[PDB]
């Protein structure tokens, strides 16, 4: 059959995901965000934070983001009977921009949760004083990196 069956297939897989997962949950009575399924997108938001902080901290310190245009190489294998090594990455001068990822409202709801916040008590790291102070401190670099603070979820057609 044409491509309708494929979209319907992933939709059925999501629906079965749900039905069985809430069956298991109501078997032992705990919310969805607490359980195994819905923490992955939170981890994705953590990876977005990681993108931000891993573009900001090398901007703060030495070595990890210096000008690699004139950084030498190494000989190995066995003392000296082989060849020099090579560096083939953004050493060239590549200027990689910044990317971001979110998800829309109704699609998230059909995925299993309308963007439910996790447990109010767990996340001492998210409210860690160190992170809050760095957010106060690194405003200059956070501006230098990206000025596009995103609001996304309200986009569905």
């Amino acid at each position: 059959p044409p491509q309708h069956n494929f979209l319907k297939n992933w939709r059925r897989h999501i629906a079965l995901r749900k039905k069985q997962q809430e069956a298991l949950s109501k078997h032992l009575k705990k919310p969805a965000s607490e359980l195994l399924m819905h923490t992955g997108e939170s981890y994705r938001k953590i990876q977005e934070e990681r993108e931000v902080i891993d573009r900001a901290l090398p901007t703060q310190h030495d070595g990890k983001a210096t000008s690699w245009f004139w950084s030498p190489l190494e000989y190995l294998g066995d003392e000296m009977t082989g060849l020099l090594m090579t560096k083939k990455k953004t050493q060239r001068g590549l200027v990689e921009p910044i990317t971001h990822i979110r998800k829309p409202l109704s699609i998230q709801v059909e995925t299993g949760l309308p963007a439910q916040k996790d447990a109010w008590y767990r996340y001492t790291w998210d409210r860690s004083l160190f992170l809050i102070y760095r957010r106060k401190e690194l405003q200059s670099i956070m501006a230098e990196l990206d000025f596009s603070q995103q609001d996304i979820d309200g986009l569905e057609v």
Partner: protein, 439 residues
């Protein structure tokens, strides 16, 4: 390239380090002086030592790790040793005051004082290296130095490097035998940090070591040196494909990526084999199938937990020495059909093949004999959750009347973190039982 930085916190961390360094220097033929004085009869050393050591312009090897302890007694004990000419004094930071099995002072009033120094040291060490993959943090849960200071350093290291692997190695308070009393108090708080801020954690106790050494090595007066030797052998076996090569190289990333099925469940079950003595290694034909079968014996586990209580989600197996793939395949065929070994109805198989051409070496004066090959395994099962349940019960029955808490109140903290840690551990155990429940 494949280079890592070790971290040693507490007296136990320092001694486990020192064991690892001496094992690596003897295994690579590295002399205690720091150079290669063997000019008459060579005995090895022409390999890739860059992963762990560093080559100077004069032919010197510089150790690469962090030796930090709040008590200067351990630092002085190491300093007066025969290996003092190897490392650098700048890497061994002494202290005025020490925690000594207390999270309070070592996390707020003692640990917070020496932060910039260690951060600068680790930053210099990182800049001195080209390729970084992960770290080897050595601490303990009983030790206050290895709990408070370790937690505060790890929380900053996590936010300072999110793209690098974050390992963990410490000692667990055995439910039967212990050294101090406030061990659960430090453990209940260190677990929250090691769970919500790290990627993997390794769990071991000492009573299992005593049981195995009495049962196999047959010693009546054990000592910490043998424990450190076993731990160093385990560590070397884990990071074997890094210092050398083989048929199938398994780097740190290669096994840590699959070693974590879920960010909340990252507590594997390590097991080393063969743990035998000299006389236990002469009239004993050693093959792969027998030792692999023995690897799943609870008697050979370093954690007191019956594997038959739960079942396995994922397993990581490694080898070191003259291993032939056909034996590995036969062992896999044997274990996959073994009814005693339990597993979920959703993971028919998962495993890795680490073949190491270089055999493990022995130590003059030690207890291990010359075994042609070695094996280590890293499995994930829910049967180990009993330790957390017992620890939670212990903390609850300590916490009903608030025994030895006014000290922590006075040092200055909130009181609700005990409730927070309790509910977090309860949620973790609930997640573990949910995972252990099949369809």
């Amino acid at each position: 390239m494949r280079e890592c930085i070790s971290i040693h916190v507490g007296q136990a961390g320092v001694q486990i380090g020192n064991a690892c360094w001496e094992l690596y220097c003897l295994e690579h033929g590295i002399q205690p002086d720091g150079q290669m004085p063997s000019d008459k009869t060579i005995g090895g050393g022409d390999d890739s030592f860059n992963t762990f050591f560093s080559e100077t312009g004069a032919g010197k090897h510089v150790p690469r790790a962090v030796f930090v302890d709040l008590e200067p007694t351990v630092v002085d004990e190491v300093r007066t040793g025969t290996y003092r000419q190897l490392f650098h004094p700048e890497q061994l930071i002494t202290g005025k005051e020490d925690a000594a099995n207390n999270y309070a002072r070592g996390h707020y009033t003692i640990g917070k004082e020496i932060v910039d120094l260690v951060l600068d040291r680790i930053r210099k060490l990182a800049d001195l290296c080209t390729g970084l993959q992960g770290f080897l943090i050595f601490h303990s849960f009983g030790g206050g130095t290895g709990s408070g200071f370790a937690s505060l350093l790890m929380e900053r290291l996590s936010v300072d490097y999110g793209k690098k692997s974050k390992l963990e190695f410490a000692i667990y308070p055995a439910p039967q035998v212990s050294t101090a009393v406030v061990e659960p108090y430090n453990s209940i708080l260190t677990t929250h940090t090691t769970l919500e801020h790290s990627d993997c954690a390794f769990m071991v106790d000492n009573e299992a070591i005593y049981d195995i050494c009495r049962r196999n090595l047959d010693i009546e007066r054990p000592t910490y040196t043998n424990l450190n030797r076993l731990i160093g052998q385990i560590v070397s076996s884990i990071t074997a494909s890094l210092r050398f090569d083989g048929a199938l190289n398994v780097d740190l990333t290669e096994f840590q990526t699959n070693l974590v099925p879920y960010p909340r469940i990252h507590f594997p079950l390590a097991t080393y084999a063969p743990v035998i003595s000299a006389e236990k290694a002469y009239h004993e034909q050693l093959s792969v199938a027998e030792i692999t079968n023995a690897c799943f014996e609870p008697a050979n586990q370093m954690v007191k937990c019956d594997p038959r209580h739960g079942k396995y989600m994922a397993c990581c197996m490694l080898y070191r020495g003259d291993v032939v793939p056909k034996d590995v395949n036969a062992a896999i065929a044997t274990i996959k059909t073994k009814r005693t070994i339990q597993f979920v109805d959703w993971c028919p198989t998962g495993f890795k093949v680490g073949i190491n051409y270089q055999p493990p070496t022995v130590v003059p004066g030690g207890d291990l004999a010359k075994v042609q090959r070695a094996v280590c395994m890293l499995s994930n099962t829910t049967a180990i959750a009993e330790a957390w349940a017992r620890l939670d019960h212990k903390f609850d029955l300590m916490y009903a009347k608030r025994a030895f808490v006014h000290w922590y109140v006075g040092e200055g903290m909130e009181e609700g973190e005990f409730s927070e840690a309790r509910e977090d551990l309860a949620a973790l155990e609930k997640d573990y039982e949910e995972v252990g429940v099949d369809s």
